Structures are given as C-alpha cells and as structure tokens.
Design a protein around this ligand. Structure first.
Ligand SMILES: C=CC(=O)N(C)CCOc1cc(Cl)ccc1Oc1cc(Cl)cc(C#N)c1
Lengths: 546, 406
C-alpha cells in the first residue's frame, strides 16, 4: 500500500437559526427496498457511507429509479430540504469560456474527473445532516439509517467544494510544467500544449499520477474524445470552432425560447436579425401571434443564412485585435471581431435601448462600449475599432455634446450607411434671419389649444388644435415656424420641454411631431433656438391661449 | 499589540457579496505580482468556498509612478460596517494657506484583524475568459480603503505624531481613509520644509513618498456676474432676463420687469435696444443684491452633500456642492489647456471635488455626473487615482442652467 495524501475537509455549517432537516421516509415497494439495500451495502463497503444509530434526528428521503431499459437500479436522495437549510458557498462558474478566447494549441486533451466527486471527503461535523432511512419490508423491522462520508451527488455544497479542492492539488503541477496550459471548468480538465504529440501525451500521464497521489480516478484509454469536442453547445475543432447546430401555430414558446436561440447563432453567423419577433412577445404565455408579413422578411436572410455553415477561429495573442461595426437600421447594429480579414474570431449584434428619442451617434457609442466590455471579458484587451463615421463627424459631436463621452482607438471605415450629424443649431443669433416668437397652449379640460408665431417682419399665424396638450402645442408652434421660414431662422420659445428635446439632438423619435421638426431642421441652413422665461411679458410672448 | 480590536457589522446585515468586474490582462498581471507578496507577508491568505463574501478589486497607477497599486471597492462593506462610533472636523484646515496630502495607509497593514470579520474582506483576482476559477483571498491585517481602518488606527496614530504638533501647534493635521491632510499657515518654503520633517518622523514608527499641494479658493460660492455692456441687443437682454429669473430662486429681491418692458414687441434678435433709465436702474439694484453672498446657508452634518457637474467646453467644467437646492455650500470651475478625452477630465474633476470636500467637511459627496452610466462604468477606473471612491449617479436631461453657471 502506498499512502494517499489526505484531502482537507471544507468547514461547512447550515444557515443560522435553521437547525436542519427531518423528512418522512416515503412508502416504497419491496423490489425498490430489495434493490436499495444492495447498493448501500456495497457503498458501505467502499467507505462512501456509514451506519448511524438512534442518535440522529435528521432524515433525508431516498427513493429508487431504474436505469431505463438497463436492469440495474439507481438510488437518489432528495436533500432538497437540506439544501434549503445548507449555508451559502462561493460559486465560480458564473460564466462559460468563449471559444474565440482560446489560443490555438498543437495538442489538446480533455480529462473527465467527475468520478472523484465521491473521492472528496466531507466535513465529518456535517456528515450528519445528510442522513437517510431505507424502508424495511412490511414495516416489521427497525429501519436502516445511513449518512454520507463524501460529497453527496445532490448536495448544494458538493460542486463548490470539489472545485476548490481540485484546484488546490493542481497548483504545483502547472507551476512545474509551464510548457502546458490547464483549464478547469466543472468536473472537467482541458490540457493544451504546443508540443510533439509524444511529449504532450506523456505529460497527460504524469498528471493522472499526480491526481492519483491524492486518489483521483481519471481516464487514459478511451478518453481522447478527440476533436470535434462537443462542449457547451459548441463544436470545437483543432483550427476552427462553431456552434453545435441546435434546435401556423406560432405558440408563445416559438417566441419565448426562440429569442435566445437566434441570438446564440449570431456569435459567428453574420447578419442574424431577431427584433421583429421581440416586438411580438410584447408584454405577454400561449398565443400564435402573427408574423406581420414583416418579421418573416428576416427569415429570408436567417433560415437562408444558417445554410452556409460558418466557422470562427481561435485567438492569437501576437496579432492585433479588430472590431468593425455596421449600422443595420431600426436601432440595429452588427459587429465582427477579427485579427485577419474574414477570419472572424466572433460576431454579434447590438440592440438599441428603449428611448423616446435617440440618435445614431449615441447608438454607436453604446455599441462600442458593449464590444469593449465583451472583449475585455474574452481576451483581456480592447480591440481597435473600425467605425462608419468620419473623424470630422465624431469631433463636432463630442466637442459640442453636453454630456461627457469617449471612444477608444478607432478608424473610419467607409462602408455605408455612414453615421452623420443631421442638423446643427447655431451658437449665436443669425444676423439677417427672420425672428419667429412662437407660443403654444392648451386647456387641461377640453384638450383644445392654439399654436402659432409672430415675427419681426409682421408675419403671423395661429392654428387651433383639438385633442392636445401644452407639450404638444409648444412643439407644434416651433414646427410652424420651421415650415413658414426661409433657409435661415431665429426661433424664440418659452418651452423648456421643447428645448430639452432639441438640446438632446435626436435624429429619430417615437413622437411623429418630433420627427417632422427634425425633418424640417435637416432642410435648414442655419437655426438659432433661443429660450426665454414664460409670463415675463417678453417681446412677442403670447393669441395662442384664447 | 497582539490584541485585535473586535469589529462587527451593524445589526441585521450580511457582509458584501459584490460581483467582481472584468479586468484587462495587464492589470490582472499586476494584481498577481502584488497579491503574491501580500500572502508572503501574511497581509492576506487564500480561502475556500465556505466564504461567499466578495468585494471588487482593481489596479491603478498613482501619481507620477509606473508601479501598479491595488484598490478594493470597499463601498458596500463601508455602508455595512458598524458605525464605529467607539473627531470634530478641523475647520482650521480649510482656512490654511497650504495643505499637503500624505499617504499613511501604507502602514495600516501592521495590525491584525478580528478573525471573525476577515470573511467580509473577501475578493477575487479574476481570470480572462473564465478559463480558471478566480484567485480568492481575505484580509488578515487592516486594509486600505476600509472605513474602520482609520478608526481602529486613530489611537495608535495620535501617539505617532504626538512629538510633532507639540513642536508645531499651528500646523493642522487631519486624516481621511489612507490619507493624512497636513495644513499650514506658513509660507510655501516653510511648508515644503516642515513637510519633509513630518515625513521621516513617520519612518521611525513605520507610498509615503507621494504628496499633494492644495491652497484655498477666494470665494467658497463664486458670485453670479451680469454683463457690463454699452449697447444691448434683444438677444443680450433676453439672456439677461433669463439669468436674473433663475437667480430669483436663490436671491429673492431680484426684479426683472423694467428689463422685460424693453422686450415687448417682436423685435429682431440682433437689434440693439437702448436701455431706459428705469431698466438701467433695475439692473443696478440687481447687481447689488448679487454682491452679497446668499444668506442663511448652513451646513448640516447629518445631511448628504450633493455635487453637480457641467461640462462647459474647452476643457472647462463647473461644479456646485449643496444639500438643499439653491443653497450652495461651494461652487467652482476646473479648467485645462487630455483635451481629447472627456472621460479623463471628468474623473479628475470628480476627484478634485471629492478631495476639496474632504478638506472642508470631512466627508465625500454624491455626484450627479453629466455622463451615461455605461460609458462612465467602462472607463473611469482607467483614470481613477485616489484611494477612496465617492458614490455617483447619472444626469440624462440637459440642464438649461449650464450657461448660467458660465
Ligand atoms: C488543437 C485543438 C483545440 O481544440 N484548440 C487549439 C482549442 C484551444 O483549446 C485549448 C487551449 C488551451 Cl491554451 C487550453 C485548453 C484548450 O482546450 C479546451 C479548452 C476549453 Cl475551455 C474546452 C475544451 C473542450 N472540450 C478544450
């Protein structure tokens, strides 16, 4: 016998105030009872469990489940009540590696270590709250009681404790084999080395011994699982990666789950559009909502897009890292991240936020930050950007925007549609331009009001309006001055609301009144917009409140 | 010394569980080199999954050094830490002709921590692309950035500079977080000297080499100024009236009607208007009102300090500190000559304002930043250089009051 080094237990407690669990052992069938005794006797043989006497008041139920057609039965324990009372643990697999983030390696071995789950001790002080009773036949004999000596399969503590210990063992092996790269996800190990398949194949051996020195079983023959590795819904190959092709009454499930499915496909499939269906979800749980004969238009570039299978490549730290962005229309943006042209590392889309108004230059900035954050997650660096916006456009925008803003290092790529500034307010009153004093007002009861203007040239207008509000009429009044004025115009308003909207420089809005103003601004040469306080009897402050 | 000053949270709260955020590879590398000596010096030690507590951590360059330093975002532990009620602000410090800031939390690490609380000082060095589990850790000693780390050392620290300040009963000494604010009425040479002396006096009991020079501002609340012109266009009067109307909320007694009378009538915006004798008089009385400071404006240590920041263009930023609106405790303008990076400027401005706020009231404010959360969230840690962090929120409507603070 060669002594195995021991695995330090993890101090485990329950939630405070909650003493623990006590559950009624369910009435079973004599076959199930006959089967379950066989396992426990063999498990006791191994040291996985131990008999407990009449001092334990905590009961966890244990039922039996046959392995489908396979005649061998299998025992399950429902610690679901021990779990509701068990303490909190630090989980670390809160995120899945991204294939595009892996460096290409000559050889890569995958070792399953899920077996050693039970090779991992338990805190002896806690082995009690895990305890189960096997119903005796005919209820005529005292039941058999048992507890676990190792991390049980259903205990919430068992994942987190396995991983922490498994890491602790591996730290010396990796420090002394710097020529290798080990990654540990969840009960799996991923060794990768740019070494002759012979040297690599034996450093896999060394490792299995190291884990054996602590008593961890691991496969040697029939562990290859050689690429294609099927993993977390990807298909990884030695030089390329992709996604495992995954799958009239358009039920809400055809919408509620198909949302994340098409998004999943768009980390490597360029031009996957998923927006019109997201509107169809609305704020709903079962309905065959229509395709609007408009959402189906994307499928003619979606189901036709999944035909040509698309692959991404693995990451090379020596090349630069580049992201390029396209405007798709409707608040939709696409990007590709890559190092050499058409050899994408991955792709994506950016969904516009729920604004009442907005403009492309803000949409672009947010897409940039999102790509920036994802790239730091995946590669630990920010990519250089290629963006469809002239440098001039970016300078004018950020220097005159009232908020702070920034894009990291980037270049103009001249694929249309370019992102542009549509209109630009003057900084100072325009000499020679007609001055329109505009005003609008409504009545909170009737929803009736007027909107109009008076000018320094004696031009005037008032239009009466039905079913309207002070905010609508203040805007209409500006819109009137824009239609009736020439290419150069000074506008005076008392509407702080109207100003707020325009000082945010939208180029598209939910309100169709706002879009008509915008469209008017675009046709102008020079617009100066001036605010004054209302009710101070200022100049042509109104006629529109009769 | 062996006794570890016991500590608990405030009644009925659990310790921090805050997501660590992604870090670039070079900052990950730096926290690796850094956090490998901190174990070798027992300042921290690894932990296992029994510990669910977590406090974010990242890396900065401090001033004029290429040596990476490590910060922990103790903001959620500091509002969960017991009051530590177990230091009336040196109002002398805000009047001193000069004040130097000295880093002293370099020596908080020489004192242990109540074995029961270390679990709440837990953090993770993160890995790229989730390839490895994070390197978790916990503090064994008193950590820089903790609200209790000055409170616990406030006893040992007073005995540290007890020789000093008995020699110099004028130099006002203040301490906030890992920073020692030493201020003098002495002239620049005499301050620059008594500084170097108080430095080595720290070494005998010991990033102390770093320090800052900061001198007071003439006006706590800068005056509101009205233009002085020989001719006024309609636009000029329209802005004037709009500004006096706004000032009427702060300085009641402001009358605008004689000026508004000159406006009635649809005159063109660039037309010169002659001022009437009435309007000229009303403008004059309005100035006199604005020459006096705003009256009956008191600080309140129970209350929160709000800071607002406007981007003015050309690297100029204006700010205001208040507790109640239209009663500013302080107002100011920071300028320049980055000039490519708006965010770099903003985060320095937030830093300068916070430090001032520590000098005046000894508590940092809450900002309302003219920036988008997601943009600010992405980049501020790349320019941050202070060992503390204020709280902040985000202004999504363009205040038309920016020019009135111009
Ligand atoms: C040439 C073959 C090849 O597959 N590559 C070059 C891809 C890079 O793969 C690795 C790169 C490194 Cl450095 C270490 C370990 C790597 O294998 C992993 C990593 C993960 Cl997360 C999951 C799996 C699985 N299943 C394998």
């Amino acid at each position: 016998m060669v002594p195995i080094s021991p695995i330090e237990t993890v101090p485990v407690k329950l939630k405070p105030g909650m003493d623990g669990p006590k559950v009624k052992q369910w009435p079973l069938t004599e076959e199930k009872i006959k089967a379950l005794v066989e396992i426990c006797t063999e498990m006791e043989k191994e040291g996985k469990i131990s008999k407990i006497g009449p001092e334990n008041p905590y009961n966890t139920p244990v039922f039996a489940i046959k392995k489908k057609d396979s005649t061998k039965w299998r025992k399950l324990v429902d610690f679901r009540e021990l779990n509701k009372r068990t303490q909190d643990f630090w989980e670390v697999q809160l995120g899945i590696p991204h294939p595009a983030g892996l460096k290409k390696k000559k050889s890569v071995t995958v070792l399953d270590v899920g077996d050693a789950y039970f090779s991992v001790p338990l805190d002896e002080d806690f082995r009690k709250y895990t305890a189960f009773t096997i119903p005796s036949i005919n209820n005529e004999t005292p039941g058999i009681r048992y507890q676990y000596n190792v991390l049980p399969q259903g205990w919430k503590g068992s994942p987190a404790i396995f991983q922490s210990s498994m890491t602790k063992i591996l730290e010396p092996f990796a420090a002394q084999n710097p020529d290798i790269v080990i990654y540990q996800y969840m009960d799996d190990l991923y060794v990768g080395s740019d070494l002759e398949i012979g040297q690599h194949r034996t450093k896999i051996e060394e490792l299995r011994q190291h884990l054996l020195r602590w008593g961890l079983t691991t496969p040697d023959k029939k562990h290859q699982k050689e690429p294609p590795f099927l993993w977390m819904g990807y298909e990884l190959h030695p030089d390329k990666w992709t996604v495992q092709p995954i799958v009239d009454s358009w039920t809400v499930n055809d919408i509620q789950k198909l949302v994340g499915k098409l998004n999943w496909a768009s980390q490597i499939y360029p031009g996957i559009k998923v927006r019109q269906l997201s509107k169809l979800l609305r704020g709903t749980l079962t309905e065959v909502i229509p395709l609007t004969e408009e959402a189906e238009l994307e499928l003619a570039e979606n189901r036709e897009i999944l035909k040509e299978p698309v692959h991404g490549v693995y990451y090379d730290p020596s090349k630069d890292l580049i992201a390029e962005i396209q405007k798709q229309g409707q608040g939709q943006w696409t990007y590709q991240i890559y190092q050499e042209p058409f050899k994408n590392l991955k792709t994506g889309k950016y969904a516009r936020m729920r604004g009442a108004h907005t403009n492309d230059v803000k949409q672009l900035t947010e897409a940039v930050q999102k790509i920036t954050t994802e790239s730091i997650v995946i590669w630990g660096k920010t990519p250089k950007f290629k963006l469809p916006i002239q440098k001039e456009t970016w300078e004018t925008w950020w220097t005159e925007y009232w908020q702070a803003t920034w894009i990291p290092e980037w270049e103009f790529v001249n694929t249309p549609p370019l992102v542009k500034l549509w209109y630009q307010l003057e900084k100072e009153p325009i000499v020679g331009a007609e001055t329109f004093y505009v005003d609008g007002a409504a009545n909170r009861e009737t929803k009736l009001g007027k909107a109009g203007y008076v000018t320094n040239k004696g031009r005037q207008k008032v239009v009466p309006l039905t079913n309207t509000t002070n905010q609508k009429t203040e805007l209409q009044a500006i819109y009137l001055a824009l239609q009736d004025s020439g290419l150069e115009v000074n506008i005076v308003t008392d509407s702080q609301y109207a100003l707020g909207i325009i000082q945010a420089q939208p180029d598209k809005s939910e309100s169709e009144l706002v879009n008509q103003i915008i469209e008017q601004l675009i046709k102008k040469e020079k617009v100066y917009l001036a605010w004054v306080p209302a009710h101070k009897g200022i100049g042509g402050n109104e006629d529109k409140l009769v | 010394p062996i006794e570890t000053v016991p500590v608990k949270l405030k009644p009925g709260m659990d310790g921090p569980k805050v997501k660590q955020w992604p870090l670039t590879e070079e900052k990950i590398k730096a926290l690796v080199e850094i956090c490998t000596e901190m174990e070798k010096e027992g300042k921290i030690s690894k932990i296992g999954p029994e510990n669910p507590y977590n406090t974010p951590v990242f890396a900065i360059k401090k001033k004029d050094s290429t040596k990476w330093r490590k910060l922990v975002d103790f903001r959620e532990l500091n509002k969960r830490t017991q009051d530590f009620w177990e230091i009336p602000h040196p109002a002398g410090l805000k009047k001193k002709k000069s004040v130097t800031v000295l880093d002293v939390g370099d020596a908080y690490f020489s004192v242990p921590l109540d074995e029961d609380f270390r679990k709440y000082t837990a953090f993770t060095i993160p890995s790229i692309n989730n390839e490895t589990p994070g390197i978790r850790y916990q503090y064994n000693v008193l950590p820089q950035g903790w609200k209790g780390s000055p409170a616990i050392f406030q006893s040992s620290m007073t005995k540290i500079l007890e020789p000093f300040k008995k020699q110099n009963p004028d130099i006002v000494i203040y301490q906030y977080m890992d920073d020692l604010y030493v201020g003098s009425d002495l002239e620049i040479g005499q301050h620059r000297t008594k500084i170097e002396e108080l430095r080595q006096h720290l070494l005998r009991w010991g990033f102390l080499w770093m320090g800052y020079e900061l001198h007071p501002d003439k006006w706590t609340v800068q005056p509101i100024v009205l233009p002085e012109k020989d001719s006024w266009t309609v636009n000029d009067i329209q802005k004037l009236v709009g500004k006096l109307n706004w000032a009427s909320q702060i300085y009641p007694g402001i009358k605008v009607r004689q000026l508004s009378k000159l406006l009635r009538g649809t005159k063109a915006l660039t037309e010169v208007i002659p001022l009437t004798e009435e309007a000229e008089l009303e403008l004059a009385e309005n100035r006199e009102i604005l020459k006096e400071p705003v009256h009956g404006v008191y600080y309140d240590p129970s209350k929160d300090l709000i800071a607002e920041i406007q981007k003015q263009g050309q690297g100029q930023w204006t700010y205001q500190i208040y507790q109640e609106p239209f009663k500013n405790l302080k107002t100011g303008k920071y300028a320049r000559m980055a000039h490519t990076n708006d965010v770099k400027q903003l985060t320095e401005a937030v830093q300068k304002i916070t430090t001032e706020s520590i000098v005046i009231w000894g508590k940092t404010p809450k900002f309302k930043l003219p920036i988008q959360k997601e943009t600010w969230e992405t980049w501020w840690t790349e320019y941050w250089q202070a060992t503390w962090i204020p709280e902040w929120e985000f202004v999504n409507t363009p205040p038309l009051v920016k020019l009135w603070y111009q």
